[PDB]
């Protein structure tokens, strides 16, 4: 089929890049990066969210493998000596596939626009003091005060989410986890300060009380968003696809990355 | 059908739980607490609880319903001003039912020992140090060293888990979450610390390293087990099932209890 | 004595000032905003953290004094009622001073600014990643990384530390305390996570690894510093005072502000 | 001297006590165990720390000092290779002397029990629910609901107080800091949530509400106390006092034991 890879760019992922490529000539398959049906990412965990936000608009066509040349990672989970017996069994085909939630952000305006995270989404003011209230299916929750917010993917959770306290959530769990940083918490603004977890069609909007800019990020991208009226989250209907390759479950990827 | 109707035993749910049977009495309604089809509750979460375990062989046969008698509950989520309407919509029936996920621990020793948890089960030490490795899914995990460990239903969440800072989960979600208390972490010793939630059919289990003797607590209950080889957590096949009066969302009862 | 006076600029703040002033004018005092020995603050902490920076090099020489309109503040611990009574017994004198300790913060680049800090200064990265080297009394303690760091005063660590995780600390105790910020910790980066409390003349130092760009905050002033070299944080030798006008314990201010 | 040594039990440990008797033999020292000069741990923090209660009335009369034939420790803080060294150096004398802060707990009943701890000293129910309320020199400061609180030494506080959020504060602030431990905090139960650092002779006392029977620790010692009217907390007057054999700095000894 159709394929392509991406690397972080430095010598060792390169050089495993053009090796893959020779190994991949030796079977029917072609190199399209317009329209590929396999997407190779050699690097990190930063590596293969590039490849995902590069695809983002044919999902459902593409899967995804990592391949890690530094430490182990969570999307990159795949070590470079692997490289010729994962060519072999990713040209025959006829692998499974396991398909991992996404979160849909939407960002509306004095138009609208709507993007999709892989890892998580979050809210920070734009310099001053960031202050929304958090709306849960059309009723308010709470004032929240503080350094800002983060809502997470369950594959995600292991990421920035981990760092603020959150759960790490098996991502066969169609869900998304909203996490506090920094909040105020005095007998005149008060927070839930737990982490919360959503399910499917759960929608979760933020909407301004005094200043109407904010930091929105969406996995690496960080945009300042003028004139904002509301920011809303959502699990996506939308899912990524990974080649499974063999069995590494999700709890032994998270004892190898922070226990042993 | 057949109901029955426990009370805290205080002065105000004793009444309130005569002037129900009272009303009962004016509908094709017996009062039969060997085999009923709907258990109410009056006074507090607690009450709810014992309720629960009461009946716990007959949960899918049970529709539970809860009234608090002083600050609002979680399970007992209707004031006492409702409960003549309610006596008149459960009486005709044509009520919906909503079903919440609960947690399965089984106790092994050198027979076996099962129990149905509403909120949550702990292990704790019998008195010197509490060390056990944690297994999931046959995979060993990590060796906790600490306090103990709470494995919480998700409508338990609200309780002892944000107590050690678990996330809020919504009881739509099948799921269990495991958090830990009082860990030490140096170079020697390392833990997660993350609460870590469960999908079905995951089996968390705990087995001892040295001292087999564990203080094991599922909800009100806590009982000293003596020559316990393992303790498996995993989500319940079988579910609590409510009857559905009118809209309370789990977000709206988390906001009353913990915001305003 | 020489006396000034400074407003949150609102109505109600204004106001109060003007009735003070002419209070004041029935006794031997003279308004001087250059040279103060007393220096009202009308309005909220921060109006008081503004009176504490216009007059830096005369700390020595001022008893500061804050009233709250407001809500109660730390510093602003006197309600407008008291306004009056304040005036006469400061008119007088003989009154009682209390002194707080402060941080003193040194930025050294490839010349030198140090600035004093009433409440805290935070260190964050200018937009990628903030990773720095602490350094205690010549010794490399850890490479941290994450979204930044907070040293904080003792009377600042009811503010910005406390939502850290930081500990409470009674401002007689001449120390600092450094909080983290959404660190990271796996297997590869380790951090201490736990807040350091430091005694007079240790000395912290944070030391860049790649980007030598930071966002520096002292208090309200947050500042992008260019091709820094160190950044070290000490308990300072100088000391604000406060006019002692009655027993208001700082536990009792911390009740009063948190819990009812 | 007067010197005397004890040991954790196991091989490595009696026999390095063995030697360094031997080699204090080549010296004017005398084994007393009765009213020594200098004892000597050989073990682990546990093994300093029944040192030290062996000897809590003769403080001021003593120099400790310890060796970790295991892992580092925070007292044992001298490998077992410097056990000639410390022999050479201690029986000339002429060494240096630092000291520690220690906590006092008083016990009331309806008599009064007095104890010193090294690390900190817990307070937990006796099975039911755990309710105190909080005053601080005489003012109340909250009423506590949870599993218990904890009041660590300074030097306690990479004990058990690390594992429950507290800070790490250097042992020559003459300091006490206080811990919850899995509070709840809903719209009726509020506490303060963080740890609190109090100076010397600030009074910090716990006092029933319902049940009068906690269990009490200090440092290893574990006790029920029934028909208690008061716990009161304050740094003690006493200290212990180390000989100083050269350099070990306690951030040095807490980059070791938690960073690498
Ligand atoms: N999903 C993930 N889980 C754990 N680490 C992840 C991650 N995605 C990325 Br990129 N990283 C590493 C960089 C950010 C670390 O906070
Ligand atoms: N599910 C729940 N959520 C919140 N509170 C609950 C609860 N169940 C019970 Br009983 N309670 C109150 C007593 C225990 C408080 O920690
Ligand atoms: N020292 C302090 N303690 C508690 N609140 C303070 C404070 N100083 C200031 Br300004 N504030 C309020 C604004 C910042 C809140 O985090
Ligand atoms: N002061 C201390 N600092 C760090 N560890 C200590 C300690 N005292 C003891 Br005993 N230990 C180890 C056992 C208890 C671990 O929580």
Not at 206 to 216: A, E, R
């Amino acid at each position: 089929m159709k394929y392509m890879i991406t690397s972080k760019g430095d010598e060792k992922s390169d050089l495993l890049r053009l090796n893959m490529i020779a190994g991949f000539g030796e079977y029917d398959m072609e190199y399209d990066d317009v329209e590929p049906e396999i997407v190779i990412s050699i690097g990190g965990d930063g590596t293969f969210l590039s490849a995902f936000h590069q695809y983002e608009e044919r999902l459902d066509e593409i899967a995804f493998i990592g391949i890690h040349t530094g430490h182990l990672g969570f999307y990159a989970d795949w070590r470079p000596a692997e490289a010729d017996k994962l060519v072999k069994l990713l040209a025959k085909g006829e692998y499974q596939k396991v398909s991992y939630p996404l979160l849909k952000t939407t960002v509306k305006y004095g138009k609208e626009a709507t993007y999709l995270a892989l890892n998580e989404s979050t809210v920070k003011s734009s310099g001053g003091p960031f202050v929304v209230d958090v709306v849960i299916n059309d009723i308010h929750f709470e004032r929240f005060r503080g350094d800002g917010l983060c809502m997470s993917t369950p594959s995600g959770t292991t990421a920035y989410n981990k760092s603020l306290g959150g759960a790490l959530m098996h991502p066969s769990i169609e869900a998304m986890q909203l996490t506090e940083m920094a909040s105020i918490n005095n007998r005149v603004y008060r927070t839930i300060g737990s982490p919360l977890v959503f399910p499917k069609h759960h929608v979760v909007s933020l909407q301004p009380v005094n200043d109407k800019d904010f930091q929105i990020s969406v996995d690496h991208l960080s945009i300042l968003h003028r004139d904002v009226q509301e920011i809303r989250y959502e699990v996506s209907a939308k899912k990524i696809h990974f080649a499974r390759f063999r069995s590494f479950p999700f709890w032994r990827r998270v004892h190898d990355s922070f226990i042993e």
